[PDB]
């Protein structure tokens, strides 16, 4: 009967928790108690990027660390030149409710998606001059929360239905589909070798997926509410995800466990974006209380705060050079930060 | 300083000019949000004032005021995450199936869910108690009574402020106003002047539905600006 299967599942879950509890000799705080803390990180709004008509939901950095795509409820994507505060392209979308955007590593394509169930791919470098839609990737039955490019011809998505998928752009045919979840998948972060990826889905669980395999190769169940952001440590062995409670936690794939909660008693608002610094030493987190905190991935103590915004931070990205951080908030402004010496 | 840099700056100026042009259309276009059951008749009203897919956007302008009305379709059962998008809209339009006695409770549960969200606290709600003529047939030709599914209906008489259209039985008026009373019962509690609820009675054929949204949205804007000046 189903009772036997339920008991077997409960026994297996007890086994998993026993294995996780066993190999947990120390906590990252114990090891890092001798590590010299970083000082107060002061970062100033070097250049504010103005022009979105309404709230910003997503941004992504070009791989050259100068260009920048942003998405707003308006129905527009703007390609900024960070260095010169210049507009390179401005793409008018078909559906106003865009919820994600990605910049192709080669600089040739940009993606977007949202409540309209489709992921759109745009050809930036066209012989005719304008930016055109290359493909509309239909097949999902729920809002599309994150889009990330693996190559010019492969893209990975995550939508409201409990589902992430890998697409072959020249065909539009969902090479693979990823099944296991119970709620809405919110975030996504490709490894820095497009071989694995992770996703957290509105059920206090984040799953690591094999792109060529499909199998859910790991799972993590530490959180207490919805998971709103996720990213890798550059090592590829760690990812930290921020939730709709006031906690950001750090997960390691090899240990298959939680490592360190970056939370404070003074914070009650949730986390809406998480991004690691180039060295894995600074962990930026966007909050609903109008400002971005900067944490220390090893010591778990705020080393800064980016108080320059008048509304909810929504997006947060660090360059591949490690030399800037950009923040988008519901005030339609996008600010670029770096320190001074 | 170089020529190519100057030309890039000029291109950025043209882009910014087009965006400033699009402000004036973005502002001065009042977004709404249509939420309603499967049998309600949402798209019916939508087509009325206009004349795997997700959002079903529609447009209509009345007396030179732009309205940009929405409709969320193939989305999962939970309304949790994507209702945050529809913050900062002028109203939420709610349509019920008035005739189908049994589903009123599901309709009221949805109403209470929309009314008390963490977002939508400042966003008003327009009702369209739809398919009223169907209720006229349902209760004119005597059949399963409202009291069958509703206990309190036995102790209910028509309130004085009613405005029965000519040719309307005094008990059918109780039929029409009992659902309105239930939904305004939900509306009056749990809310203090930040937002309100505007009941309406609409058959499937009536044409004056765009004007009602015009008047209601005018009211929302006026009450907002009056509270901002502490005259209300």
């Amino acid at each position, epitope marked *: 009967e189903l009772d036997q299967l339920r008991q077997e599942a409960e026994q297996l879950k007890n086994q998993i928790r026993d294995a996780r509890k066993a190999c947990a000799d120390a906590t990252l705080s114990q090891i890092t108690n001798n590590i010299d803390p970083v000082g107060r990180i002061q970062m100033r709004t070097r250049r504010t990027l103005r022009g979105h008509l309404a709230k910003i939901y997503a941004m992504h950095w070009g791989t050259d660390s*100068r260009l920048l795509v942003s998405a707003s409820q308006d129905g527009k994507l703007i390609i900024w030149d960070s260095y010169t505060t210049n507009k390179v392209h401005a793409i008018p979308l078909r559906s106003s409710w865009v919820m994600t955007c990605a910049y192709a590593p080669s600089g040739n394509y940009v993606a977007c998606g949202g409540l309209d169930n489709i992921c759109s791919i745009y050809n930036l470098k066209t*012989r005719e001059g304008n930016v055109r839609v290359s493909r509309e990737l239909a097949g999902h039955t729920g809002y599309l929360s994150c889009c990330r490019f693996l190559d010019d011809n492969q893209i990975v998505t995550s939508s409201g239905d409990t589902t992430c998928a890998l697409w072959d752009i020249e065909t539009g045919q969902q090479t693979t589909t990823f099944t296991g979840h119970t709620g809405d998948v919110m975030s996504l972060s490709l490894a820095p070798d497009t071989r694995l990826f992770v996703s957290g889905a509105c059920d206090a669980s984040a799953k690591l997926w094999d792109v060529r395999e499909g199998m859910c190769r790991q799972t993590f169940t530490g959180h207490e509410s919805d998971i709103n952001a996720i990213c890798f440590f550059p090592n590829g062995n760690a990812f930290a995800t921020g939730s709709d409670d006031a906690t950001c936690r750090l997960f390691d794939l090899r240990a298959d466990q939680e490592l360190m909660t970056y939370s404070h008693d003074n914070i009650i608002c949730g986390i809406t974006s998480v991004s690691f610094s180039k060295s894995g030493r600074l962990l930026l987190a966007g909050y609903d209380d109008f400002n971005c905190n900067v944490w220390d991935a090893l010591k778990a103590d705020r080393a800064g705060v980016l108080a320059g915004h008048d509304n909810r931070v929504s997006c947060l990205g660090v360059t591949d050079d490690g030399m800037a951080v950009a923040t988008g908030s519901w005030d339609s402004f996008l600010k670029i930060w770096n320190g001074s010496s | *300083l170089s*020529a*190519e840099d100057k030309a890039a700056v000029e*291109r950025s100026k043209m882009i910014e000019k087009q965006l400033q042009k699009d402000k004036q259309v973005y502002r001065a276009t009042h977004r709404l949000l249509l939420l309603g059951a499967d049998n309600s008749g949402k798209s019916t009203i939508v087509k009325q004032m206009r004349i795997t897919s997700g959002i079903f956007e529609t447009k209509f302008q009345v007396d030179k005021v732009n309205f940009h009305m929405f409709d969320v379709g193939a989305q999962r059962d939970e309304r949790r995450k994507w209702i945050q998008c529809f913050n900062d809209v002028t109203a939420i339009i709610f349509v019920v199936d008035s005739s189908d006695y049994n589903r009123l409770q599901e309709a009221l549960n949805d109403f209470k869910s929309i009314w008390n969200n963490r977002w939508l606290r400042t966003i008003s709600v327009i009702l369209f108690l739809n398919k009223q003529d169907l209720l006229a047939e349902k209760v004119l030709a005597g059949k399963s009574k409202i009291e069958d599914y509703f206990p309190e209906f036995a102790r209910y008489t028509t309130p004085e402020d009613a405005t029965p259209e000519p040719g309307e039985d005094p008990r059918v008026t109780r039929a029409k106003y009992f659902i309105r009373d239930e939904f305004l019962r939900i509306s009056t509690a749990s809310g203090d002047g930040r937002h309100y609820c505007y009941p309406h009675f609409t058959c499937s054929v009536d044409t004056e539905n765009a004007r009602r949204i015009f008047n209601d949205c005018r009211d929302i804007i006026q009450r907002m600006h009056l509270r901002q000046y502490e005259l209300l």
Partner: single-chain antibody
Amino acid sequence: VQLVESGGGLVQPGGSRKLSCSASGFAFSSFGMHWVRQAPEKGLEWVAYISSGSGTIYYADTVKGRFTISRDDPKNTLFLQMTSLRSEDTAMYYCVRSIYYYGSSPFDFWGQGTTLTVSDIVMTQATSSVPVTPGESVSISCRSSKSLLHSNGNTYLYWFLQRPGQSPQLLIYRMSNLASGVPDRFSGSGSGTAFTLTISRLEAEDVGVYYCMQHLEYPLTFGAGTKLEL
């Protein structure tokens, strides 16, 4: 993309004539245009410029108070109103498109040309002819008066190739890049004053005249050509 322009022929000295360039196949409003001219047996020479939005217009010293440039975005045509034509205006006028944003490739398409016949920075191409046999690696040079390396990293040297009876064609933009449809053989290097264009394995479709242009500041000035014969 396809640009054709017409409006040339014999004109008595002192007259006037309008040249029109009918663009079709690309978003004309997003591109700024140029006019470049080629004397009957000489090199290239920049003539005018009108930008996207029609807001910036430049000319050359020898046509400035005498020629005007205008565009019609809805009709996808570009004009050049020549007035009081002198005998030094016999040339093969071209209609060159150029878009300027971060990472663009200016001078990426050249029209076929129209024939007109009337009855500050110096770019030196000391060489003027090079014999070569197929499969040998060539190296064409070009020198500058000022230093073209602007403070922002760009070098603003352009290289072109016009084959025996064809319109020119972009090979290198900003001294180190490759146009869209150009073989990997071509490669350009330079220091900031002295420049080279190195073909790896020459083929019979590579014979022609190679031109170097600067784009640091107006006016734009060309070389004299470096013909490769076979």
